[PDB]
């Protein structure tokens, strides 16, 4: 079984800026590879074909090339709708085999996300349980540090976060943490709060409410 | 134009069997290998099979060798992909796909893939709940609601707002497992302060595997 061993796992790069996907066959191949483009929910599209050969419809910006065991894919100019996860492939015995994968996101300004706390339903607490849910919608970069304070006490262990994929429009990102505790231990407590550090904040940002109020 | 169209997947219980079947139009399967790829939740790409279908020659992974048997029938341009003895390991969407043939041995046409899915866990719609807006919501602003979409399994769901109408500004998360198993997800939009009130907000949730249907309306708690 030959392996393809591919880097980097991900990249972060402006639009039109030159993007280098590289992997490295575990022994001779030949140019018998190829190069494909995954984008979140859909199938694998092949973008280029023995070593360095532009596969139909694909932009001209897409180019493979080969040197020895190395293989490159290059995007010359990275454009918006280029995030995704980017795969080489052997197809030179069998099995064919896969590279691990490059997801590739773009980079742009930093934008502060706008913060949003809820509370839980009167609906969901006749079940039993609370779910308070904090937003931070539509910011750059991706990473965040999201705190639940209950009544002033820091939480552990029990929210989770979700973060969605990259926007096309405005390559923002957005993410939800929700937290769960039982209906009585929501209804001992008065202030919840979630507190938000990100780059594009100068200061931390807390959004809170007081239970019943 | 060459299309490739998985069917057969869904929930099964761990020990079972499922056949996949793939249809091919625009081109003949003689002329061709045909492959299932698969891919796990979260992970890369793992080929499975393959076969030539004029002389039904097979080749399997070493992962599914002995439980999988891929299979052809030209007569319906079909490949099928017999998969038994399953575990929870081959929790995937599969995905059917081609060489080009003649000397090409790229694989140019995919399907759009069919999710299994191996568990023991029951089917279970979601409860829906409205995320309110704020009353603190700026006079003349922007505002967020939402609905929570919680305790159901297995995935997908689907949401909509207010029946397709409202698309802007619309983030619905990726579903996180739960440490009871089941899935949750949020969806959230944002819109103007001064529509609280007067525009309708309605979520529109879907869930095929339990044909589960709730529209929830989100409005200003009272
Ligand atoms: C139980 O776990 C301790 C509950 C603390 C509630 C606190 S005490 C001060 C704040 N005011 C109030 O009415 N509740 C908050």
């Known amino acids: 079984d030959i392996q393809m061993t591919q880097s980097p796992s991900s990249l972060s790069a402006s639009v039109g800026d030159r993007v280098t996907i590289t992997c490295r066959a575990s022994?001779?191949?030949?140019?018998?590879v190829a190069w494909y483009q995954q984008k979140p929910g859909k199938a694998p599209k092949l973008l280029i074909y023995s070593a360095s050969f532009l596969y139909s419809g694909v932009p001209s910006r897409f180019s493979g090339s080969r040197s020895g065991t190395d293989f490159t894919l290059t995007i010359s100019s990275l454009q918006p709708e280029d995030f995704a996860t980017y795969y080489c492939?052997?197809?030179?015995?069998?099995?064919?085999?896969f590279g691990q994968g490059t997801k590739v996101e773009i980079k742009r300004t930093v934008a502060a996300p706008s913060v949003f706390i809820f509370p839980p339903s009167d609906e969901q607490l006749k079940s039993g349980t609370a779910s308070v849910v904090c937003l931070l919608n539509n910011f750059y970069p991706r990473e965040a540090k999201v705190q639940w304070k209950v009544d002033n006490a820091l939480q552990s262990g029990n929210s989770q976060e979700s973060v969605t994929e990259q926007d096309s429009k405005d390559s923002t990102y957005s993410l939800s943490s929700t937290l769960t505790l039982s209906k009585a231990a929501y209804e001992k407590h008065k202030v919840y709060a979630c507190e938000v550090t990100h780059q594009g904040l100068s200061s931390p940002v807390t959004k809170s409410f007081n239970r019943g109020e | 134009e060459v299309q490739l169209v998985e069917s057969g997947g869904g929930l099964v219980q761990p020990g079972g069997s499922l056949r996949l079947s793939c249809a091919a139009s625009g081109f003949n399967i003689k002329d061709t290998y045909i492959h299932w790829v698969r891919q796990a939740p979260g992970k890369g790409l793992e080929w499975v099979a393959r076969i030539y279908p004029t002389n039904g020659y097979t080749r399997y992974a070493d992962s599914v060798k002995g439980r999988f048997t891929i299979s052809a029938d030209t007569s319906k341009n079909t490949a099928y992909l017999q998969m038994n003895s399953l575990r929870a390991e081959d929790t995937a969407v599969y995905y059917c796909?081609?060489?080009?043939?003649?000397?090409?041995?790229?694989?140019?046409?995919w399907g759009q893939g069919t999710l299994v899915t191996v568990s023991s866990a029951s089917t279970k719609g979601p409860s829906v709940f409205p995320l309110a807006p704020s009353s603190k919501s700026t006079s003349g602003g922007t505002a967020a609601l939402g609905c929570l979409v919680k305790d159901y399994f297995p995935e997908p769901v689907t949401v909509s707002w207010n029946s397709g109408a409202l698309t802007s500004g619309v983030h619905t998360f990726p579903a996180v497992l739960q440490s009871s198993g089941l899935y949750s997800l949020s969806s959230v939009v944002t819109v103007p302060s001064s529509s609280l009130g007067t525009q309708t907000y309605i979520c529109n949730v879907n869930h095929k595997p339990s044909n589960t249907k709730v529209d929830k309306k989100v409005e200003p708690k009272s």
């Open positions: 492939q052997q197809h030179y015995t069998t099995p064919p085999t």
């Open positions: 022994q001779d191949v030949n140019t018998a």
């Open positions: 796909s081609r060489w080009g043939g003649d000397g090409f041995y790229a694989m140019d046409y």
